RNA sequence: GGAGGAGGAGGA
RNA sequence: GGAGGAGGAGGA
């Protein structure tokens, strides 16, 4: 995991 | 360095 | 949290 | 670029 890891919500 | 490292231009 | 830089809108 | 998560607006 990196932050809100490749739980890509936004998907920034 | 980071990214834009604490060369922090807007310092987001 | 520096190991990415992918990205700066967080900063540290 | 994953080790932070500080932050998700990049994703990798």
Do not use: D, F
Not at 1 to 12: A, E, F, H, L, R
């Amino acid at each position: 995991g990196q932050w809100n890891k490749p739980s890509k919500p936004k998907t920034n």
